[PDB]
Design a protein around this ligand. Sequence first.
Ligand SMILES: CCCCCCCCCCCCCCCC(=O)OC[C@H]1O[C@H](O[C@@H]2[C@H](O)[C@@H](O)[C@H](O)[C@@H](O[C@H]3O[C@H](CO)[C@@H](O)[C@H](O)[C@@H]3O)[C@@H]2OP(=O)(O)OC[C@@H](COC(=O)CCCCCCCC[C@H](C)CCCCCCCC)OC(=O)CCCCCCCCCCCCCCC)[C@@H](O)[C@@H](O)[C@@H]1O
Ligand SMILES: CC(C)=CCC/C(C)=C/CC/C(C)=C/CC/C(C)=C/CC/C(C)=C/CC/C(C)=C/CC/C(C)=C/CC/C(C)=C\CC/C(C)=C/CC1=C(C)C(=O)c2ccccc2C1=O
Ligand SMILES: CC(C)=CCC/C(C)=C/CC/C(C)=C/CC/C(C)=C/CC/C(C)=C\CC/C(C)=C/CC/C(C)=C/CC/C(C)=C/CC/C(C)=C/CC1=C(C)C(=O)c2ccccc2C1=O
Ligand code: HEC
Ligand code: HEM
Ligand code: HEM
Ligand SMILES: CCCCCCCCCCCCCC(=O)O[C@H](COC(=O)CCCCCCCCCCC)COP(=O)(O)O
Ligand code: FES
Lengths: 184, 139, 73, 102, 51, 533, 58, 223, 42
Amino acid sequence: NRPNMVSVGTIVWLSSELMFFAGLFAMYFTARAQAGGAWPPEPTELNLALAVPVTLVLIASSFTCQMGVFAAERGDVFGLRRWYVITFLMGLFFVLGQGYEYIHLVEHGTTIPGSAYGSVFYLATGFHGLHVIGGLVAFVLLLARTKMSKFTPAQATAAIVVSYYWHFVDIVWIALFATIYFVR
Amino acid sequence: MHIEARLFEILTAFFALAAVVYAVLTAMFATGGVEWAGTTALVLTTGLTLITGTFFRFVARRLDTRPEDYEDAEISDGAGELGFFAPHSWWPILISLSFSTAAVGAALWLPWLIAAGVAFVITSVCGLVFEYYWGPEKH
Amino acid sequence: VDVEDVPSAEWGWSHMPIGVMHIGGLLSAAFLLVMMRGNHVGHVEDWFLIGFAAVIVALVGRNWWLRRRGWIR
Amino acid sequence: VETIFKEPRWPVPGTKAEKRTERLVAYWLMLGGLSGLALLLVFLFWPWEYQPFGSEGEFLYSLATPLYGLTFGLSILSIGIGAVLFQKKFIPEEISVQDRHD
Amino acid sequence: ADMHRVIKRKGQESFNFGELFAYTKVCSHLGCPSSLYEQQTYRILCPCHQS
Amino acid sequence: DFAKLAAAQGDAIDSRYHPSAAVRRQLNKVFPTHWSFLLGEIALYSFIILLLTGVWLTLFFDPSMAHVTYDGVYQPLRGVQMSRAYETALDISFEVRGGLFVRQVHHWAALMFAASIMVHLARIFFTGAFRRPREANWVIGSLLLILAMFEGFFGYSLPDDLLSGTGIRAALSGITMGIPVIGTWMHWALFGGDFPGEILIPRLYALHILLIPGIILALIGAHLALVWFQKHTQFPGPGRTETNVVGVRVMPVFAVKSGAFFAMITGVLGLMGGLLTINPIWNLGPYKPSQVSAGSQPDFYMMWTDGLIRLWPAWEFYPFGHTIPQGVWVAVGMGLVFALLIAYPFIEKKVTGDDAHHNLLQRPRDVPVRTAIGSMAIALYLLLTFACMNDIIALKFHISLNATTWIGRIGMVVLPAIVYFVAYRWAISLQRSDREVLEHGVETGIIKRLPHGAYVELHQPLGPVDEHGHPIPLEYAGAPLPKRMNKLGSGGAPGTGSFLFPDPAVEHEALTEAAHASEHKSLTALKEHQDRI
Amino acid sequence: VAFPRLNALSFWLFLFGALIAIAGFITPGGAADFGWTAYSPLTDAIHSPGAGGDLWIM
Amino acid sequence: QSALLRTGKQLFETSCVSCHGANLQGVPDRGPSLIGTGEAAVYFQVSTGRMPAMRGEAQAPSKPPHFDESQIDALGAYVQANGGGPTVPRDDHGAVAQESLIGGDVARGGDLFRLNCASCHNFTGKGGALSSGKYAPDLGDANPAQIYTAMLTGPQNMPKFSDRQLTPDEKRDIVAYVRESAETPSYGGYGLGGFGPAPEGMAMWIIGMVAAIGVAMWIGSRA
Amino acid sequence: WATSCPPPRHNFTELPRIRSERPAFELHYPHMVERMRAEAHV
Ligand SMILES: CCCCCCCCCCCCCCCC(=O)OC[C@H]1O[C@H](O[C@@H]2[C@H](O)[C@@H](O)[C@H](O)[C@@H](O[C@H]3O[C@H](CO)[C@@H](O)[C@H](O)[C@@H]3O)[C@@H]2OP(=O)(O)OC[C@@H](COC(=O)CCCCCCCC[C@H](C)CCCCCCCC)OC(=O)CCCCCCCCCCCCCCC)[C@@H](O)[C@@H](O)[C@@H]1O
Ligand SMILES: CC(C)=CCC/C(C)=C/CC/C(C)=C/CC/C(C)=C/CC/C(C)=C/CC/C(C)=C/CC/C(C)=C/CC/C(C)=C\CC/C(C)=C/CC1=C(C)C(=O)c2ccccc2C1=O
Ligand SMILES: CC(C)=CCC/C(C)=C/CC/C(C)=C/CC/C(C)=C/CC/C(C)=C\CC/C(C)=C/CC/C(C)=C/CC/C(C)=C/CC/C(C)=C/CC1=C(C)C(=O)c2ccccc2C1=O
Ligand code: HEC
Ligand code: HEM
Ligand code: HEM
Ligand SMILES: CCCCCCCCCCCCCC(=O)O[C@H](COC(=O)CCCCCCCCCCC)COP(=O)(O)O
Ligand code: FES
């Protein structure tokens, strides 16, 4: 009969977090306008054979995260744990996939000090990867709390607000993925 | 809670108008074309009010009038338990100390101090989250 | 000490004489003042010693005066 | 000495939790055995001789001592973890009072 | 250019060969080698106890 | 088969030694289970590991000062003149399989041993375990801490490298020779002439491998025997009195826990020995009096002595054609600290006047003056230790080296005063926090709005209540009081099953009923015992 | 307030964050000297190499 | 080459007159004279990024360079033409020598470094603090040419070791030890910074004691 | 201004009827309630 206080606090903070990514987006666009015709410039060669499967995994993690919310709203703690463990594994795969992309980009001459494109690319995607890592920590902390006490409505609220952050992270990546790999 | 999001929708419309006007006015008769830094900030400033306003719009249409949303409600209408509010906790000062340790390490570029700070933050945040959920000791 | 000031007054050592803290503070300031004797050629440190010694002396004097007048016990 | 409290950890027999806890203790002991065998194998076959700077074997040599501590440390630590778990999950909980007569 | 700032010790006014000076490397405090010679400030720093 | 052999051997042992009454007494002895009681075992386990690794090291170490030419595999030191002590120390870490691991484990074990004593000493001081009839047990331990300090100091001086050789030259030589009247005669008797001489390392080797460890082992045996027959002090609580010991018997609970703790302590030291580089002597080179590197810090247990040297001003006296150097201040101050540490229980019993038998510990919050004094001493020790690292701190943290010396100098007098005042207020404030629970109950954190608009917080009484509903105020009993509802069991249990799949409902109900039945009986047994006595 | 513990966290984050920036005055180089506006490239490591500016940022 | 000289002066005018003067005589209380410092001093001071300096303090720190290799050579030639002085070693192709400066006797370089450098830079070039706000920076980033020029020119508080006090072969041996002691991995695990007991005691207290006390909590009981 | 100085731990031992932006003024001056509604508009 009353709005969820934790949900309102999380959504309010999630809106503010978007302005942090606004600054990173401004840096990428400012450097893109000064590229001069090459964006990305040589020797940076983005490959979609790896980014696309990595992006699809993160998108699929949102669906399983939503499934855990349905279990949490249903009062099924075991269903919530199964879906959030699966979500954590795919979220971890996203971090490993991004890092594996980072290793090959560095070997081919795309680094933060190497070029202006490397600076904006790594800051924008790296800070998002830090947000993904923070989301994985939230999953572990929330799941550890599931083994401490009985499944209460306040505990179910904590599961919902964590999924809000995960959905926010996934949506931001879609903007980053479309802006970097398609709007060149 | 119909007033709360009406505040954000009003801000959303103005931010959307300013973002569109600034982008168009910088595209024409402005050196360098579209000024990307301000346009990006204005566009995503509209996003901030849009997400909060849309959420408040969905919450408002679900639940009926609250006692604080009534134009003639009585004090006795709000009787009952409000919720959980933490009485005391020394974890927040530990979280800030943990975060300040990482910032000092990042300021002076000491990777060992950064690693210690990150580990301290995780432990401090874990204590705050688990403070009111730890069970009794089992022996 | 009374249980109103220290609730666990009967469970352990809970009282330290005020004379010990007052004399210790005066000796605290005196040791700071004698440390200006040395091989250092700068005087930035000397002013820091003087300031800390003055603060300690002022605190000791304020506490002693307030206890003498009876405003604090 | 008077034992005022003494109860078994699993009064209800035939429970899945008891079998699950039994495997948890065995898993830590199995890890200790695997790490102890690994310590035996790395000490005998890992390249341990010093290699000069800029040589091909320098990197493998630099991991010789680190591998000794990782395998030795994890082995006995896992055994200790399993022993603690066995006491806290299978050894009956007891409270005993002894007169000091001091 | 810094030779005018040199102050001589009694009984040691002629111990230097022009602008060359020789001082013991052993610190007078506890015997550590005080060899942190700063050329501009002309300060000899002992790494053991900061003399 | 296996049962008959045990019975046959048991009868054979009993027929020849009749150790039945005595062994049963050792199996039935009760030890309290508090976590802080295990702090003395960490130091004991570290010493055992030191003995095991130390014996291994003696099979390869040549403690000679004779100068030789290096012929080992370490290329950056090929041909460099060095002593045999530095020669074999490189041989252990390079020419013997596992020698580097053993040498690192030994030195990490020393660091844990020194750190364990300081932490274990803190509990003894703050909880009042030093009081009678345990004054002599405190005194024996204080000697053990001093012996450990010098044993560790001699330990890393054996390799005769540049870093430790510099530490020997200052601490062992200059301070000793600066002592008035007999100071130079002590230097000649210990070095066999002038520094460095030719007999220092062999003599230090003997002192470090036989004499000091032999004295430590004898004192440890007396420590364990005293803390094995005088019994162990326990914290106040339900059923705990001045004449009983509450806990678990040795067999099998305490033996398993102690043995498992030994395995875990060894693993931590084994991992650190093989995951963190400690004392890389090959990077420092052999000791030469003409060489000197920056950051000449000793081991952390010997830093406060070095910090005292760095901080004390250059105050010297020259009476009648003689010299009293600055090292005399440190030498006298070092002795004063040891004298105060050893004789503290008698000082307190003289000041407080309390000379009664004590078997129940005191919570540190309940003794604000001693807690403030101990916090003051800890702050002084920490500042002295960090003053030894002032040059290292100055480089890494961008602080003037002159500033760090004066910060430590002024802080040496100001910071202990601040810490004493803060700790004294903090200790009393925790007493007030404990009281608030007693007359009002545990704050559940749930806010309720009354029909007339009052905001009240629901409280959980710890005892009987009034007819109005307010709990009867309870009297403090020296025991910790709950402050979180989740610690009282209000959170319940998640549900019996694996992390991903639930167990059948009947099994969960049976398990939770058995658990609730077991906890109630345990509480009832303690309550019935407390009521009887 | 809605989040009593988050409210307390803000105070300490604010107190320790302010102390970090002010702590530049104890460094030999000093604190930040590029103005509170911190205009670029004056704040670049080339033009502001000191640790006082870094403490100001963090 | 007249092209290299006028390029160096043209770079000098808008970057180095405010503190060093238009004729390289130095500006009192702002900067010393650059006459006789040589090309080696300019190469070190600019390639290490130490110059142009930004303010007066205890010690000018290193930072990203303000000029590239071609501009450094032009600046060095302009200063070299005014008073002469030492020059940076060069290879056959005329580039700044880096690999050819690595000496073949690292054992000799180690003893020389411990006699002449360890006091200010530490056993393994990790850096060390000086009197008042000054310090000997860590040596793990300098290339062999930078180390050679630092030994030649003696920057700020470091002694100006001449080619007679330390012969070119001795200098090459020292930089060989400096370069190898920075690129050699630790043998007993993580290096902990290489500063000695001070990180070692910190690591023990924060890792082993925390684990030991944390394990004691798990095995033991409260109250 | 409708609570004690200082307010209790939970800020309120009671709450008045809220009908405008001056609840404390209405609580302390009930006779002025009619006047404020009548004179609110110029
Ligand atoms: C149960 C408990 C028991 C367990 C306890 C065990 C814990 C230990 C764990 C770690 C073990 C690792 C083993 C591998 C060892 C190894 O193979 O080693 C590689 C090399 O690595 C470093 O080379 C760097 C470069 O590669 C070189 O290229 C470069 O040259 C070099 O630079 C030096 O040399 C230059 C000149 O050459 C100088 O110019 C320069 O300045 C410097 O000196 C670099 O070194 P450096 O910067 O030192 O650090 C760089 C470090 C970054 O730091 C760090 O690790 C910090 C973190 C650890 C350090 C120790 C802790 C610090 C504590 C402090 C007290 C904090 C302060 C707090 C204050 C509060 C209190 C105060 C009051 O990055 C990394 O490795 C990244 C790796 C991170 C891995 C994390 C581990 C994951 C654990 C997860 C466990 C899960 C378990 C779950 C179970 C269920 C040097 O070491 C080399 O020698 C070494 O060879
Ligand atoms: C290169 C290379 C590899 C070389 C390295 C060399 C090296 C470092 C070797 C170390 C090897 C080590 C240390 C191995 C042994 C590890 C170990 C402890 C074994 C594992 C045990 C284990 C996993 C347990 C499972 C089952 C089991 C056997 C249970 C425990 C059995 C027993 C009898 C325990 C042994 C532990 C022990 C020594 C003590 C228990 C007995 C008693 C009564 C302790 C004595 C005692 C204690 C401990 C007190 O707490 C105490 C407190 C107050 C007053 C007095 C006392 C007192 O006298
Ligand atoms: C005489 C004497 C005692 C000197 C000390 C004087 C002094 C001013 C000390 C500290 C000064 C500092 C920390 C300067 C930085 C500027 C700054 C932010 C100031 C503090 C501001 C303030 C008080 C408010 C913020 C809140 C707050 C309290 C946070 C600060 C927390 C931090 C980061 C403190 C750490 C300071 C400190 C002394 C710790 C050093 C510990 C040691 C011994 C480190 C040795 C060490 C080193 C050096 C390694 O290289 C290494 C490499 C790899 C692994 C490990 C290590 C390692 O541990
Ligand atoms: C103390 C008096 C020193 C002695 C002896 C040596 N060095 Fe040094 N060095 C010292 C300082 C204060 C500085 C910084 C000066 C600057 O102008 O900023 C240096 C610098 C170096 C460098 C440059 C390092 C860089 O930042 O990459 C190198 C390579 C260097 N020093 C090496 C070096 C060698 C090989 C020495 C023995 C001959 C030596 N230094 C002695 C302080 C002192
Ligand atoms: C070699 C170092 C030491 C070892 C191995 C050691 C070992 C132990 C052990 C195992 C115990 C029993 C467990 C415990 O209460 O923690 C104990 C108790 C005790 N130790 Fe230590 N100890 C050492 C040093 C010290 C020091 C430095 C002091 C005090 C200065 C001290 C004084 C005591 C006292 C008074 C007890 C009484 C036990 C009690 O009443 O709880 N010991 N010691
Ligand atoms: C309290 C007990 C002890 C402490 C604190 C201690 C401490 C130390 C330390 C810190 C070192 C230097 C380690 C290193 O070189 O890296 C050392 C060296 C040594 N210790 Fe011990 N030690 C102890 C007991 C013993 C015992 C009992 C022996 C022999 C039985 C022993 C034999 C040695 C040997 C041979 C060395 C030198 C060989 C080497 O440098 O590696 N120690 N000791
Ligand atoms: C290296 C091995 C050294 C010897 C270790 C011996 C270990 C096996 C002990 C077997 C005990 C037999 C118990 C029994 O029920 O048989 C009993 C043997 O008779 C005894 O009472 C023996 C008393 C002396 C036992 C002292 C042993 C101390 C060992 C401590 C171990 C922690 C048979 O009695 P019963 O008929 O069952 O009543
Ligand atoms: S040894 Fe030179 S200062 Fe003490």
